[PDB]
Write a protein that binds this ligand. Structure first.
Ligand SMILES: [Cl-]
Ligand SMILES: [Cl-]
Length: 87
């Protein structure tokens, strides 16, 4: 897989959705990216695993915790991602 850093320009709505978190026992993953939106402009993609949100490790975050941190992020929103390249 490939490590990437994305700065998403603000303000929110950022134009994406996430799934997973510690309370779901799964990594935080981008599920939907709005066809027209900030996340799409920044080349955030469905399936991208969020490794960090504004420098903060995402692994131990609850789902609602990751959501809130994204929703309330300063501009730009900084995401560190792990992009799976395998089919
Ligand atoms: Cl891979
Ligand atoms: Cl990087």
């Amino acid at each position: 897989s490939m490590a990437l850093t994305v700065d998403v320009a603000g303000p929110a709505p950022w134009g994406f959705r996430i799934t997973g978190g510690r309370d779901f026992h799964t990594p935080i993953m981008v599920t939907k990216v709005a066809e027209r939106g900030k996340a799409k402009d920044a080349d955030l993609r469905p399936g991208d695993i969020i490794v960090a949100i504004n420098g903060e490790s995402a692994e131990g975050m609850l789902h609602a915790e990751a959501q809130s941190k994204i929703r309330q992020s300063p501009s730009p929103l900084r995401l560190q991602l792990d992009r799976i390249t395998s089919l």
